[PDB]
Every structure is written in C-alpha cells, then in structure tokens.
C-alpha cells in the first residue's frame, strides 16, 4: 500500500493541486461549490508510483529508450492540505500525521510569503525537516529573475532547521522537470522505519458516508473514517474504540468493529504504517456524515489512550509572530484566553489556567486523548483569525 | 359527430323519465333541452312546473340548471314534445340522476375517442350500444366488468382498434415524510434496514445517511393518516433497542 505519508505545502492560490494533478493525475476536486472556484477545506488525496528505470509515472520502460521495464520502488500518497491563513487547523492535523514534506514557491509572487514561511515554521516544529522545496510559477519569469529569487530563497533558508533541503524548478501545468522530484522521493526522503509490535494508534482527520442518493435501505453501507496510522498494522476483523468520545457535560467514547480497512483504490487484508487510510466500520454513516470524525482517535480494543481537558503543558514561543507580512512582536501569553492548541489532530479552543517560566497549565472546552506525550503546535488570536505563536508538549 | 342518440328511438317514447335544463321561460314554459339526446329540444307547461305559479324573480334562479322530467306526450314525425315534472316520485328522481350520471361517464369515455381518432361517433356508438344496452344495463358496469373479463370486447367488433386501446386506457396519493435518521451508534444500519423491512412493504427513498424522503401512499387520502403516524411509531421504536437517535418531522 501507501508506504510514506508525503505532505504539500504552499500559498493559497500558486497550485498545490496543480503540481499533485501533474504528479498523480489524481485530482484533489475542489468542492462545495465555495472551493470549486476557490479553495479547499477537507485535505486533497493522490496515490502517485515509484517504479524506477534503472537499466516512474507508469509500470512500462516503453518511454526512456531501454525497453527493460519499469523496476518497482514504491508507492506513495499525498497529505495536501489548505494554505491559507483562516484554515490552519487542518494543516496543523495534516503535520502531525505527515512522514515528510514539499514545499511550493511561485517564481513571480514574493521569496517571503507570510503563509509558506508560517508552514515552514510549523514543519520544522512537528519533526518534518524533509522538505523537497519546488519552484511552481517559473513559466512565467526571466532568465535573471528566477536565478535572483532562487539565491534569495537559499539565503532565506541558512538559520532555518533546512539546511541543505533540495530545491526543483517544476511546470505543474506544462509537465516538465518532475523527473528530477521523483529522484529525490527516493533520494533525500527515506522512509522512518514503521514496526509491527509498536502500539497501534490511528488519527482520524475525515468522515464519509458512501450512502449514495436514490439507494433502497435494504441495501446499506455502513460507515467509513478517513484516518493514518504512524503505529500498528491494522488487520481486517478487529474491534475499535474512538476516545475523544460522543458528548452528553461529559463526553463517552465511540466502539466500532471494522466492517473494511481500505488503502489505495483496492481493500486490502492489512494497513501496514505510515499511510493514510480509509477505515470502514461498523459505526452509524450518519455519524460520518460531513466532517464529524476530524482530529479523533482511534485505537484497537483493550487500549487506554487518556481523555484530557485539564492539562500539564511544556511551551515554547517566538520572539516575532508569522501569518502576517507586519511579523508582530510576541507579547507574553495572558491568563483566561482562548487559544487554539493542535495536538496531533485535534485543534481545541483552550483557556490558560497558569503561566510560568517554561511550562503552562491549561483548561479545555473540548477534551483530547493523550496515550503518549504527544506533539503540539499552538495557536493564538490577536488579529482576528489564527496566528502562530510557538509549540508544546504534554508533559505526562 | 358531437353527440348523439341513446338507444335507436328518435325520441323519448311515452311516459318515460328523462333528465332536461330549462333553457328559458316567457309564457308557454320552459324549451327545456333534452339532455339524453343533446341537440334534440323539447318543452313544458308553467302549471306543470310545480303547482305554485312561478315568480320572475324565482324563474331566474332556475334557469341554465337541470333536473329531471317525466315526458307525457310525443310526436312521432315532430320534435315538438312536451314534458312534465309534477308527476315525478322522489325516488325516480335519484334513479334517472344515478341513470345520468352514469351517461355522462359513459358518453365523456367516447368524446374525446372519437373526436381525436376522427372517426364518425355514432357508428362505434352503436355497435358498443346494441350488444351491452339490449343484453343487459349498459356501458358503466358493463365496462368495469369488461377490464376483468375480456368476452365484452370479442362479442362484438369496433371499426378501428385504436379506440379499443383508449378505452382500456382511461379507466385503467402521497403523504411526503422527511424523516431525519440523527444516529450517533453502531448497530444503527442493522435498525434501519429493519425499519425498511416494515414500512415498505410505501414508496421509501434514501436520500443521505440522515434524510430519507418517504411518500406514504393514502387511499381515502386519510388512510394514510394511519399509515404515517404507524411507520412514525416503528422509528420511535427501533432506535431504543440498537443505540442511535432517530427525529421525525
């Protein structure tokens, strides 16, 4: 299946969609009738091949000379998420859910872009470093231009966590110069090692019903989760428990037994790590019926993950603020305020219940599940919609 | 053409009861119209009508509507004949009003046949009207029988078939529910087909996961106030024993 879960990142508006349509072919829609002229809110899926010509986009050597037939490398899938600045939450869920990273640059829109450095920033915070960085809109600039802008972006990237993270000039819409990204799929990206005996664990970030309009009830389907695993080969006929729960306030963990586990575009017997996955369950589909199982998770039954609301948090911030041009000073965090804090998944609204020197308690309006110490980044609101401040971990 | 006779007499043969509309009144009575033999016309004495000496103001009101008349005399060679209904019992007046009723849904089933399969209307009229009007009462049960038992259409034949298959054509309601399936569980599907297994066996149609459109047939229109507040009762039922929540509107 889906070896390596590979993100795409980039400014609204420069084709992350177009370069994952050029990758695959597999399109992300672009839906709701909004984001069919505009942008995505749910994340955009494609399963792109990796079958080397050693002696690819297709599994036949037919195309580059030697007709010794393309030699399987691997299979991977696509985590494309929205890059604008009012829709980070789904981002941030992408993050923690990612195994590596793409960066977009248009060539004649700026080298710094408020949004692209914002993701940046929140990869280098979620362990994401693996960035193979593409210049997308370079059929439209100078022979000098594009040069400039590509020398500003190296000087960009020197104090940064990229060192030496590397960089291709693409045609998203035109197909060319992909070859050399493909290469490095393999070349600067190897796939983290993903074991058997690790304690299963998966983070769901969609719901689907496939209840089509005009169907008779006695032949019904039951409901499907939209989740990656990053611990755990899921096998087919096993029994689930949801752990954010179904809320009453108190809120009570959902049980499901898998009716599917699909990956690819063909069911398979098992969902081996490090891919993301289309679960069916034996779970009402009115319970995922638009976007109702986004940042829950799910784990094999006789497991306890713990649901907290009152939590123990290390933090760390910025000096200066990103999301905006206008990088603000970051004043010191204030008690009792609404803050977003993404952990994992999920992207709860928290109060602040204390501040110290390096560590922060805070109240939760929607209570999240901590097996591990899990890995955070946080979110604040200071100019209407959310910026990024700085990241955390629950200390437990 | 338009209309014609009922049954090969030129007129109604004496001290039979017919059905008119008095067209209007100076001073011999009415010219009341014959409504069996539409275009024919006949008349009728004032002290005939009633026995109270009409009002001008009371002859206005009646004019245009029908009722029923006994007929007295006729001319054989004339259409000048006259009618009656004083000597009208009660009971033959629901008779020849049932007996209307049923020409007038005997004759609207042919109209429209014969003025758009353009055929003269009287021949096919006829040859319908000697077998099932001498044999026994004519066209109205003679036709709701005639759908089930196939013998009335090979005793005897019609000039064309076409008129055959329109007259099979003519003589041979939905209570919307948008019932909203809120489930938050994990034995719901096994509900919901249940649910389908009972109220659709009445047209049921899925529509998400939560909507489903069912339009619950009525056969008195209020019959299926008994069918809908039913299936109602079953939703409520169901969801409690499996663990979801179904809403009705």
Same mark, same amino acid.
């Given at each position: 299946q889906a070896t390596i879960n590979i993100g795409t990142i980039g400014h609204v508006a420069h084709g992350k969609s177009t370069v994952v349509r050029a990758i695959?072919?597999? #399109?992300?829609?672009?839906? *709701?009738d909004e984001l069919e002229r505009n942008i995505t809110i749910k994340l955009g899926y494609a399963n792109a091949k990796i079958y080397k010509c050693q002696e690819e986009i297709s599994? *036949? $050597? #037919?195309?580059?000379? $030697?007709?010794?037939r393309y030699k399987l490398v691997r299979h991977v899938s696509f985590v494309d998420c929205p890059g604008h600045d009012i829709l980070m939450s789904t981002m941030l869920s992408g993050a923690a859910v990612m195994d590596a990273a793409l960066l977009l640059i248009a &060539?004649?829109?700026? $080298?710094? #872009?408020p949004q692209t450095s914002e993701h940046l920033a929140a990869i280098e915070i979620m362990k994401l470093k693996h960035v193979i960085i593409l210049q997308n809109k370079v059929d439209l600039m100078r022979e000098e231009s594009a040069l400039e802008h590509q020398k500003s972006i190296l000087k960009f990237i020197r104090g940064t966590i990229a060192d030496g993270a590397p960089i291709v000039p693409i045609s998203a819409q035109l197909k060319y110069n992909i070859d050399a990204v493909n290469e490095f799929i393999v070349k600067t990206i190897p796939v983290p090692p993903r074991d058997f005996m690790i304690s299963p664990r998966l983070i769901v970030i969609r719901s689907f019903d496939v209840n089509k309009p005009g169907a008779e009830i006695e032949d019904l389907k039951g409901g499907v989760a939209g989740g990656s695993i990053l611990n755990g080969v899921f096998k087919l006929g096993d029994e689930i428990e949801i752990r954010p729960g179904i809320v009453t306030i108190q809120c009570k963990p959902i049980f499901s037994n898998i009716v599917s586990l699909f990956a690819e575009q063909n069911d398979l017997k098992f969902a081996v790590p490090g891919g993301l996955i289309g679960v069916g369950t034996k779970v009402d589909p009115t319970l995922c019926?638009?976007?109702?199982?986004?940042?829950q998770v799910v784990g094999a039954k006789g497991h306890l993950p713990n649901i907290y609301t009152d939590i123990e948090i290390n933090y760390f911030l910025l000096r200066r603020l990103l &999301?905006? *041009? *206008? #990088?603000a000073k970051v004043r010191k965090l204030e008690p009792n305020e609404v803050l977003m804090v993404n952990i994992g998944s999920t992207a709860t609204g928290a109060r602040v219940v204390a501040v110290k020197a390096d560590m922060a308690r805070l109240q939760l309006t929607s209570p999240a599940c901590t097996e591990i110490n899990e890995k955070i980044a946080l979110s604040r609101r200071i100019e209407k919609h959310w910026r990024l401040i700085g990241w955390a971990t629950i200390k437990k | 053409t338009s209309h014609c006779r009922?049954?090969?007499?030129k007129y109604p043969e004496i001290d039979d009861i017919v059905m008119v509309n008095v067209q209007q009144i100076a001073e011999m009575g009415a010219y009341v119209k014959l409504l069996e033999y539409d275009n024919i016309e006949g008349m009728i004495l004032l002290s005939e009508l009633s026995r109270r000496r009409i009002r001008s103001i009371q002859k206005l009101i009646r004019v245009g509507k029908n009722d029923v008349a006994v007929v007295l005399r006729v001319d054989k060679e004339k259409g000048y004949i006259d009618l009656s209904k004083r000597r009208v019992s009660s009971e033959d007046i629901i008779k020849c009003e049932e007996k209307y009723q049923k020409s007038k849904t005997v004759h609207s089933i042919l109209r429209y046949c014969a003025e758009k399969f353009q055929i003269p209307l009287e021949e096919l009229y006829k040859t319908i009207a000697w077998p099932l009007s001498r044999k026994f009462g004519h066209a109205y049960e003679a036709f709701k029988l005639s759908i089930i038992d196939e013998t009335v259409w090979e005793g005897i034949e019609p000039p064309s078939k076409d008129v055959l298959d329109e007259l099979k054509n003519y003589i041979s309601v939905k209570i919307r529910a948008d019932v909203e399936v809120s489930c938050f569980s994990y034995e719901g599907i096994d509900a919901i087909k249940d649910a389908l297994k009972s109220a659709e066996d009445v047209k049921v149609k899925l529509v998400a996961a939560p909507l489903y459109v069912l339009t619950t047939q009525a056969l008195d229109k209020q019959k299926g106030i008994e069918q809908l507040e039913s299936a109602i009762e079953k939703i409520t039922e169901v969801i409690t024993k499996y663990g979801g929540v179904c809403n009705i509107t």
């Open positions: 695959s072919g597999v #399109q992300t829609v672009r839906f *709701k599994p *036949k $050597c #037919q195309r580059p000379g $030697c007709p010794g &060539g004649n829109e700026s $080298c710094p #872009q019926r638009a976007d109702r199982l986004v940042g &999301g905006v *041009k *206008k #990088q | 009922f049954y090969e007499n």
